[PDB]
PDB file of all heavy atoms in Angstrom:
ATOM      1  N   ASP A 213     -15.203  14.951  33.128  1.00121.51           N
ATOM      2  CA  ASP A 213     -14.580  14.530  31.879  1.00121.51           C
ATOM      3  C   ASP A 213     -14.526  15.636  30.835  1.00121.51           C
ATOM      4  O   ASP A 213     -13.780  15.501  29.859  1.00121.51           O
ATOM      5  CB  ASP A 213     -15.323  13.322  31.304  1.00121.51           C
ATOM      6  CG  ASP A 213     -15.099  12.057  32.114  1.00121.51           C
ATOM      7  OD1 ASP A 213     -15.358  12.074  33.336  1.00121.51           O
ATOM      8  OD2 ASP A 213     -14.672  11.042  31.522  1.00121.51           O
ATOM      9  N   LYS A 354     -21.571  -2.492  14.548  1.00140.11           N
ATOM     10  CA  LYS A 354     -22.172  -2.761  15.848  1.00140.11           C
ATOM     11  C   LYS A 354     -23.671  -2.952  15.654  1.00140.11           C
ATOM     12  O   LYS A 354     -24.347  -2.070  15.113  1.00140.11           O
ATOM     13  CB  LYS A 354     -21.895  -1.626  16.834  1.00140.11           C
ATOM     14  CG  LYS A 354     -20.476  -1.602  17.373  1.00140.11           C
ATOM     15  CD  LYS A 354     -20.328  -0.572  18.482  1.00140.11           C
ATOM     16  CE  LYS A 354     -18.941  -0.623  19.102  1.00140.11           C
ATOM     17  NZ  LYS A 354     -18.803   0.333  20.236  1.00140.11           N
ATOM     18  N   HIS A 402     -20.515  -8.151  22.759  1.00108.80           N
ATOM     19  CA  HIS A 402     -19.820  -6.970  23.271  1.00108.80           C
ATOM     20  C   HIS A 402     -20.676  -6.403  24.400  1.00108.80           C
ATOM     21  O   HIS A 402     -21.650  -5.690  24.144  1.00108.80           O
ATOM     22  CB  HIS A 402     -19.593  -5.946  22.167  1.00108.80           C
ATOM     23  CG  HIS A 402     -18.751  -4.781  22.585  1.00108.80           C
ATOM     24  ND1 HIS A 402     -17.418  -4.905  22.913  1.00108.80           N
ATOM     25  CD2 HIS A 402     -19.051  -3.468  22.725  1.00108.80           C
ATOM     26  CE1 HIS A 402     -16.934  -3.720  23.238  1.00108.80           C
ATOM     27  NE2 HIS A 402     -17.905  -2.830  23.132  1.00108.80           N
ATOM     28  N   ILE A 403     -20.309  -6.724  25.638  1.00109.56           N
ATOM     29  CA  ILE A 403     -21.094  -6.371  26.815  1.00109.56           C
ATOM     30  C   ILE A 403     -20.379  -5.251  27.558  1.00109.56           C
ATOM     31  O   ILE A 403     -19.237  -5.420  28.005  1.00109.56           O
ATOM     32  CB  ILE A 403     -21.316  -7.584  27.731  1.00109.56           C
ATOM     33  CG1 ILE A 403     -21.979  -8.722  26.953  1.00109.56           C
ATOM     34  CG2 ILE A 403     -22.161  -7.194  28.935  1.00109.56           C
ATOM     35  CD1 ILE A 403     -22.214  -9.970  27.774  1.00109.56           C
ATOM     36  N   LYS A 404     -21.051  -4.113  27.691  1.00112.74           N
ATOM     37  CA  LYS A 404     -20.571  -2.974  28.460  1.00112.74           C
ATOM     38  C   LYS A 404     -21.540  -2.711  29.613  1.00112.74           C
ATOM     39  O   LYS A 404     -22.473  -3.481  29.857  1.00112.74           O
ATOM     40  CB  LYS A 404     -20.411  -1.747  27.559  1.00112.74           C
ATOM     41  CG  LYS A 404     -19.243  -1.830  26.588  1.00112.74           C
ATOM     42  CD  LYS A 404     -17.938  -1.414  27.250  1.00112.74           C
ATOM     43  CE  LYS A 404     -17.965   0.056  27.639  1.00112.74           C
ATOM     44  NZ  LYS A 404     -16.677   0.499  28.243  1.00112.74           N
ATOM     45  N   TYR A 407     -24.532  -0.442  27.472  1.00111.79           N
ATOM     46  CA  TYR A 407     -25.222  -1.055  26.346  1.00111.79           C
ATOM     47  C   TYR A 407     -24.593  -2.405  26.035  1.00111.79           C
ATOM     48  O   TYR A 407     -23.447  -2.680  26.398  1.00111.79           O
ATOM     49  CB  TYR A 407     -25.197  -0.150  25.106  1.00111.79           C
ATOM     50  CG  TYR A 407     -23.815   0.127  24.548  1.00111.79           C
ATOM     51  CD1 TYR A 407     -23.231  -0.732  23.624  1.00111.79           C
ATOM     52  CD2 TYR A 407     -23.103   1.255  24.932  1.00111.79           C
ATOM     53  CE1 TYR A 407     -21.974  -0.482  23.109  1.00111.79           C
ATOM     54  CE2 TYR A 407     -21.845   1.515  24.420  1.00111.79           C
ATOM     55  CZ  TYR A 407     -21.286   0.643  23.509  1.00111.79           C
ATOM     56  OH  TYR A 407     -20.034   0.895  22.997  1.00111.79           O
ATOM     57  N   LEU A 464      -3.872  -1.632  34.052  1.00140.24           N
ATOM     58  CA  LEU A 464      -2.901  -1.143  33.083  1.00140.24           C
ATOM     59  C   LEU A 464      -3.320   0.236  32.587  1.00140.24           C
ATOM     60  O   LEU A 464      -4.420   0.401  32.047  1.00140.24           O
ATOM     61  CB  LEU A 464      -2.768  -2.117  31.914  1.00140.24           C
ATOM     62  CG  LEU A 464      -2.012  -3.413  32.203  1.00140.24           C
ATOM     63  CD1 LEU A 464      -1.985  -4.296  30.969  1.00140.24           C
ATOM     64  CD2 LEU A 464      -0.599  -3.108  32.676  1.00140.24           C
ATOM     65  N   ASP A 466      -2.610   2.931  29.870  1.00140.01           N
ATOM     66  CA  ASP A 466      -1.974   3.076  28.568  1.00140.01           C
ATOM     67  C   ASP A 466      -1.259   4.420  28.490  1.00140.01           C
ATOM     68  O   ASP A 466      -1.897   5.476  28.555  1.00140.01           O
ATOM     69  CB  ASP A 466      -3.011   2.951  27.455  1.00140.01           C
ATOM     70  CG  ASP A 466      -2.389   2.627  26.109  1.00140.01           C
ATOM     71  OD1 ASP A 466      -1.211   2.981  25.890  1.00140.01           O
ATOM     72  OD2 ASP A 466      -3.079   2.013  25.268  1.00140.01           O
ATOM     73  N   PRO A 469      -1.998   5.920  24.012  1.00141.83           N
ATOM     74  CA  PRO A 469      -3.192   5.438  23.306  1.00141.83           C
ATOM     75  C   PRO A 469      -3.327   6.077  21.934  1.00141.83           C
ATOM     76  O   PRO A 469      -3.809   7.208  21.812  1.00141.83           O
ATOM     77  CB  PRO A 469      -4.345   5.845  24.236  1.00141.83           C
ATOM     78  CG  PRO A 469      -3.709   6.624  25.388  1.00141.83           C
ATOM     79  CD  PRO A 469      -2.328   6.992  24.961  1.00141.83           C
ATOM     80  N   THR A 471      -5.294   5.336  19.499  1.00143.34           N
ATOM     81  CA  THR A 471      -6.652   5.424  18.978  1.00143.34           C
ATOM     82  C   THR A 471      -7.365   6.703  19.393  1.00143.34           C
ATOM     83  O   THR A 471      -8.440   6.991  18.857  1.00143.34           O
ATOM     84  CB  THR A 471      -7.467   4.212  19.431  1.00143.34           C
ATOM     85  OG1 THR A 471      -7.464   4.139  20.862  1.00143.34           O
ATOM     86  CG2 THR A 471      -6.876   2.933  18.859  1.00143.34           C
ATOM     87  N   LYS A 472      -6.803   7.467  20.327  1.00143.38           N
ATOM     88  CA  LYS A 472      -7.371   8.746  20.730  1.00143.38           C
ATOM     89  C   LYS A 472      -6.716   9.931  20.033  1.00143.38           C
ATOM     90  O   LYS A 472      -7.196  11.059  20.182  1.00143.38           O
ATOM     91  CB  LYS A 472      -7.261   8.925  22.250  1.00143.38           C
ATOM     92  CG  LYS A 472      -8.419   8.332  23.043  1.00143.38           C
ATOM     93  CD  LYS A 472      -8.440   6.813  22.980  1.00143.38           C
ATOM     94  CE  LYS A 472      -9.627   6.251  23.745  1.00143.38           C
ATOM     95  NZ  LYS A 472      -9.704   4.769  23.642  1.00143.38           N
TER      96      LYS A 472
ATOM     97  N   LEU B 322      -4.244  -4.586  25.631  1.00131.59           N
ATOM     98  CA  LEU B 322      -4.644  -3.222  25.312  1.00131.59           C
ATOM     99  C   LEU B 322      -5.052  -3.046  23.855  1.00131.59           C
ATOM    100  O   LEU B 322      -5.494  -1.955  23.480  1.00131.59           O
ATOM    101  CB  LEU B 322      -3.514  -2.247  25.653  1.00131.59           C
ATOM    102  CG  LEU B 322      -3.176  -2.107  27.139  1.00131.59           C
ATOM    103  CD1 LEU B 322      -2.040  -1.117  27.339  1.00131.59           C
ATOM    104  CD2 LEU B 322      -4.405  -1.683  27.928  1.00131.59           C
ATOM    105  N   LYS B 324      -7.703  -3.880  21.208  1.00130.82           N
ATOM    106  CA  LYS B 324      -9.075  -4.364  21.166  1.00130.82           C
ATOM    107  C   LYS B 324      -9.375  -5.044  19.837  1.00130.82           C
ATOM    108  O   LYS B 324      -8.908  -4.613  18.778  1.00130.82           O
ATOM    109  CB  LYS B 324     -10.049  -3.211  21.404  1.00130.82           C
ATOM    110  CG  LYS B 324     -10.076  -2.729  22.845  1.00130.82           C
ATOM    111  CD  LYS B 324     -10.019  -1.215  22.930  1.00130.82           C
ATOM    112  CE  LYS B 324      -9.974  -0.749  24.376  1.00130.82           C
ATOM    113  NZ  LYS B 324      -9.832   0.729  24.482  1.00130.82           N
ATOM    114  N   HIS B 326     -12.362  -5.300  18.459  1.00128.36           N
ATOM    115  CA  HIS B 326     -13.375  -4.541  17.740  1.00128.36           C
ATOM    116  C   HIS B 326     -12.841  -3.229  17.173  1.00128.36           C
ATOM    117  O   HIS B 326     -13.632  -2.407  16.698  1.00128.36           O
ATOM    118  CB  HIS B 326     -14.575  -4.269  18.652  1.00128.36           C
ATOM    119  CG  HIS B 326     -14.210  -3.649  19.965  1.00128.36           C
ATOM    120  ND1 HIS B 326     -13.783  -4.392  21.044  1.00128.36           N
ATOM    121  CD2 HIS B 326     -14.214  -2.358  20.373  1.00128.36           C
ATOM    122  CE1 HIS B 326     -13.537  -3.585  22.061  1.00128.36           C
ATOM    123  NE2 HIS B 326     -13.790  -2.346  21.680  1.00128.36           N
ATOM    124  N   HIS B 327     -11.525  -3.015  17.212  1.00131.27           N
ATOM    125  CA  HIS B 327     -10.896  -1.848  16.606  1.00131.27           C
ATOM    126  C   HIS B 327     -10.315  -2.157  15.231  1.00131.27           C
ATOM    127  O   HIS B 327      -9.354  -1.511  14.801  1.00131.27           O
ATOM    128  CB  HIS B 327      -9.814  -1.286  17.528  1.00131.27           C
ATOM    129  CG  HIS B 327     -10.347  -0.419  18.626  1.00131.27           C
ATOM    130  ND1 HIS B 327      -9.529   0.308  19.463  1.00131.27           N
ATOM    131  CD2 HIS B 327     -11.616  -0.158  19.021  1.00131.27           C
ATOM    132  CE1 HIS B 327     -10.270   0.978  20.328  1.00131.27           C
ATOM    133  NE2 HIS B 327     -11.540   0.712  20.081  1.00131.27           N
ATOM    134  N   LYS B 410     -13.047   6.383  14.414  1.00126.06           N
ATOM    135  CA  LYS B 410     -14.055   5.896  15.342  1.00126.06           C
ATOM    136  C   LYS B 410     -15.352   6.673  15.165  1.00126.06           C
ATOM    137  O   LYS B 410     -15.343   7.900  15.024  1.00126.06           O
ATOM    138  CB  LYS B 410     -13.568   6.017  16.787  1.00126.06           C
ATOM    139  CG  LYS B 410     -12.444   5.065  17.151  1.00126.06           C
ATOM    140  CD  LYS B 410     -12.085   5.187  18.621  1.00126.06           C
ATOM    141  CE  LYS B 410     -11.081   4.126  19.033  1.00126.06           C
ATOM    142  NZ  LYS B 410     -10.734   4.220  20.478  1.00126.06           N
ATOM    143  N   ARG B 411     -16.469   5.949  15.172  1.00123.25           N
ATOM    144  CA  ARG B 411     -17.792   6.537  15.021  1.00123.25           C
ATOM    145  C   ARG B 411     -18.676   6.060  16.162  1.00123.25           C
ATOM    146  O   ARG B 411     -18.692   4.867  16.480  1.00123.25           O
ATOM    147  CB  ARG B 411     -18.410   6.165  13.669  1.00123.25           C
ATOM    148  CG  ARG B 411     -17.519   6.490  12.478  1.00123.25           C
ATOM    149  CD  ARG B 411     -18.148   6.063  11.160  1.00123.25           C
ATOM    150  NE  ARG B 411     -19.344   6.834  10.842  1.00123.25           N
ATOM    151  CZ  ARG B 411     -20.585   6.402  11.021  1.00123.25           C
ATOM    152  NH1 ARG B 411     -20.834   5.199  11.512  1.00123.25           N
ATOM    153  NH2 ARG B 411     -21.602   7.196  10.696  1.00123.25           N
ATOM    154  N   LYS B 412     -19.406   6.988  16.775  1.00122.01           N
ATOM    155  CA  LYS B 412     -20.241   6.682  17.926  1.00122.01           C
ATOM    156  C   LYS B 412     -21.706   6.581  17.517  1.00122.01           C
ATOM    157  O   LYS B 412     -22.159   7.240  16.580  1.00122.01           O
ATOM    158  CB  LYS B 412     -20.075   7.743  19.016  1.00122.01           C
ATOM    159  CG  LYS B 412     -20.624   7.325  20.370  1.00122.01           C
ATOM    160  CD  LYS B 412     -19.897   6.097  20.894  1.00122.01           C
ATOM    161  CE  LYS B 412     -20.655   5.448  22.039  1.00122.01           C
ATOM    162  NZ  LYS B 412     -21.948   4.867  21.581  1.00122.01           N
ATOM    163  N   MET B 413     -22.441   5.742  18.235  1.00120.65           N
ATOM    164  CA  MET B 413     -23.857   5.496  18.026  1.00120.65           C
ATOM    165  C   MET B 413     -24.640   5.842  19.288  1.00120.65           C
ATOM    166  O   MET B 413     -24.087   5.831  20.395  1.00120.65           O
ATOM    167  CB  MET B 413     -24.102   4.028  17.643  1.00120.65           C
ATOM    168  CG  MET B 413     -23.317   3.030  18.478  1.00120.65           C
ATOM    169  SD  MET B 413     -21.537   3.131  18.200  1.00120.65           S
ATOM    170  CE  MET B 413     -21.446   2.771  16.448  1.00120.65           C
TER     171      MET B 413
HETATM  172  O1  IHP E 601      -9.572   3.911  28.275  1.00 94.62           O
HETATM  173  P1  IHP E 601      -9.777   2.729  27.322  1.00 94.62           P
HETATM  174  O2  IHP E 601      -9.323   1.453  28.040  1.00 94.62           O
HETATM  175  O3  IHP E 601      -9.109   2.923  26.003  1.00 94.62           O
HETATM  176  O4  IHP E 601     -11.385   2.588  27.120  1.00 94.62           O
HETATM  177  C1  IHP E 601     -12.095   2.907  25.905  1.00 94.62           C
HETATM  178  C2  IHP E 601     -12.500   4.373  25.936  1.00 94.62           C
HETATM  179  O5  IHP E 601     -13.344   4.586  27.088  1.00 94.62           O
HETATM  180  P2  IHP E 601     -13.077   5.402  28.442  1.00 94.62           P
HETATM  181  O6  IHP E 601     -11.910   6.316  28.283  1.00 94.62           O
HETATM  182  O7  IHP E 601     -14.384   6.145  28.741  1.00 94.62           O
HETATM  183  O8  IHP E 601     -12.867   4.346  29.535  1.00 94.62           O
HETATM  184  C3  IHP E 601     -13.301   4.711  24.690  1.00 94.62           C
HETATM  185  O9  IHP E 601     -13.695   6.099  24.726  1.00 94.62           O
HETATM  186  P3  IHP E 601     -13.554   7.114  23.435  1.00 94.62           P
HETATM  187  O10 IHP E 601     -12.669   6.505  22.400  1.00 94.62           O
HETATM  188  O11 IHP E 601     -14.980   7.359  22.928  1.00 94.62           O
HETATM  189  O12 IHP E 601     -13.007   8.435  23.986  1.00 94.62           O
HETATM  190  C4  IHP E 601     -14.539   3.833  24.644  1.00 94.62           C
HETATM  191  O13 IHP E 601     -15.356   4.186  23.508  1.00 94.62           O
HETATM  192  P4  IHP E 601     -16.913   4.560  23.503  1.00 94.62           P
HETATM  193  O14 IHP E 601     -17.101   6.008  23.801  1.00 94.62           O
HETATM  194  O15 IHP E 601     -17.449   4.154  22.126  1.00 94.62           O
HETATM  195  O16 IHP E 601     -17.560   3.648  24.554  1.00 94.62           O
HETATM  196  C5  IHP E 601     -14.094   2.386  24.536  1.00 94.62           C
HETATM  197  O17 IHP E 601     -15.242   1.525  24.386  1.00 94.62           O
HETATM  198  P5  IHP E 601     -15.674   0.672  23.085  1.00 94.62           P
HETATM  199  O18 IHP E 601     -14.423   0.597  22.199  1.00 94.62           O
HETATM  200  O19 IHP E 601     -16.187  -0.670  23.477  1.00 94.62           O
HETATM  201  O20 IHP E 601     -16.719   1.519  22.351  1.00 94.62           O
HETATM  202  C6  IHP E 601     -13.327   2.024  25.796  1.00 94.62           C
HETATM  203  O21 IHP E 601     -12.928   0.639  25.732  1.00 94.62           O
HETATM  204  P6  IHP E 601     -13.534  -0.617  26.539  1.00 94.62           P
HETATM  205  O22 IHP E 601     -14.801  -1.073  25.902  1.00 94.62           O
HETATM  206  O23 IHP E 601     -12.444  -1.695  26.546  1.00 94.62           O
HETATM  207  O24 IHP E 601     -13.734  -0.130  27.979  1.00 94.62           O
END
Side-chain angles (χ1 to χ4, degrees):
Chain A
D213 289 55
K354 285 188 175 183
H402 187 66
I403 304 179
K404 289 277 295 182
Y407 63 87
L464 286 179
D466 199 333
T471 57
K472 273 68 182 177
Chain B
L322 294 180
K324 287 134 183 176
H326 52 277
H327 279 188
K410 290 184 173 181
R411 307 178 67 259
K412 195 62 195 67
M413 44 293 300

